[PDB]
Design a protein around this nucleic acid. Structure first.
Lengths: 130, 118, 118
DNA sequence: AGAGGATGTGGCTTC
DNA sequence: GAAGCCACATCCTCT
């Protein structure tokens, strides 16, 4: 059971998701015990690799992000607004296929982000379960 | 095997103390068990946080999956959760795509931890 | 008591005095020069009589069992907090690494002269 | 001699 | 007063 049957409702109802749908404040959690200089080079270089550790400050819910489908100019974007990074990555959170969307300031190492259901991947996965 | 349900329908985890001293080894080794089928070698990582600490400092929060079991060797909590408040565990099984199972109000970590009243 | 060591170090009677503030209080008392003194190199000092320092430390802390063994463990806890470091190679020689000049208001040369350290 | 891990202890402050 | 936060005090293993 990689996913929950009521995949669509579980996301449109449960508080856990509703409070994470809005444009909540996010932040880089990586190496919080090191010089800011280092946290910057680590966060960016890691993004170019398609991964990063981001957590929703407000709720405090951490998440390990994998910027890939299933190097990737589409997901990990570094164009829009020089100095920022508009990352993106899917995942199965609590039996609910979703996608993570947000941005982070290459200097402040934080920003905003949110979640959203994944019609397609949810469908596919819901099939594997039959 | 004293397991407990997680926020994901595909994962279970061992029981954790309700209160514990930071940087202190746990009474029982933490484990993550997959209901479905996960390929051996798959990495599993743990993370924690809440309103008072957006991301707690952990030690050895990484483990490899083997026979549907990820044994965390000496997982410790360094970051504190706050007076009365608890941590929200975020387990992540690195598959493609990666699966994540949370566990709210999992454990409370403080300086002294469990301690008789004076 | 050339100058108010513990006083300028932050100590304000509130709660127990800290080990580093205590040692400073001894290093500024011309009389305690026989068992503890400055080496003349910056804020580096050496306990010429570890047992005597421990005894007084114990006495000021009401911990009679206290001995240099226990006291040195207190100093080693300063290594990370960057308050006092060890001088590698020199037996019983340590060094304040915090900003004593700001706290005390005097420079090493000045305090040495004042304390008539030879 | 000395580094540092584990765990308990008493003073004090905040809830 | 309980429940946190600190700075040790004790004991020990290893080099």
């Amino acid at each position: 059971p990689r996913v929950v049957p009521d995949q669509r409702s579980k996301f449109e109802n449960e508080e856990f998701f509703r409070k994470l749908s809005r444009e909540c404040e996010i932040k880089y959690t990586g190496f919080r015990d090191r010089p800011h200089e280092e946290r910057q080079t680590r966060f960016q270089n890691a993004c170019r690799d398609g991964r990063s550790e981001i957590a929703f400050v407000a709720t405090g819910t951490n998440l390990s992000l994998q910027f890939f489908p299933a190097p990737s100019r589409e997901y990990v974007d570094l164009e829009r607004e020089a100095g920022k990074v508009y990352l993106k990555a899917p995942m199965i959170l609590n039996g609910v296929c979703v996608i993570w969307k947000g941005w982070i300031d290459l200097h402040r190492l934080d920003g905003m982000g949110c979640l959203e259901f994944d019609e397609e991947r949810a469908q596919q996965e819901d099939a594997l379960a039959q | 095997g004293e397991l407990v349900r997680t926020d994901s329908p595909n994962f279970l985890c061992s029981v954790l103390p309700t209160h514990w001293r930071c940087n202190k080894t746990l009474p029982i080794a933490f484990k993550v068990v997959a209901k479905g089928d996960v390929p051996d070698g798959t990495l599993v990582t743990v993370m924690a946080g809440n309103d008072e600490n957006y991301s707690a400092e952990l030690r050895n929060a990484t483990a490899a999956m083997k026979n549907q079991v990820a044994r965390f060797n000496d997982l410790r909590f360094v970051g504190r959760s706050g007076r009365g408040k608890s941590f929200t565990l975020t387990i992540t099984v690195f598959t493609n795509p990666p699966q994540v199972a949370t566990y709210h109000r999992a454990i409370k970590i403080t300086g002294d931890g469990p301690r008789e009243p004076r | 008591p050339v100058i108010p060591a513990a006083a300028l170090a932050g100590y304000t009677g509130s709660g127990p005095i800290q080990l580093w503030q205590f040692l400073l209080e001894l290093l500024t008392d011309k009389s305690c020069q026989s068992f503890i003194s400055w080496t003349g190199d910056g804020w580096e000092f050496k306990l010429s009589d570890p047992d005597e320092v421990a005894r007084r430390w114990g006495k000021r802390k009401n911990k009679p069992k206290m001995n240099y063994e226990k006291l040195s463990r207190g100093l080693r806890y300063y290594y990370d907090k960057n308050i006092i470091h060890k001088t590698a190679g020199k037996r019983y020689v340590y060094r304040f690494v915090c900003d004593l000049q700001s706290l005390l208001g005097y420079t090493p040369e000045e305090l040495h002269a004042m304390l008539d350290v030879k």
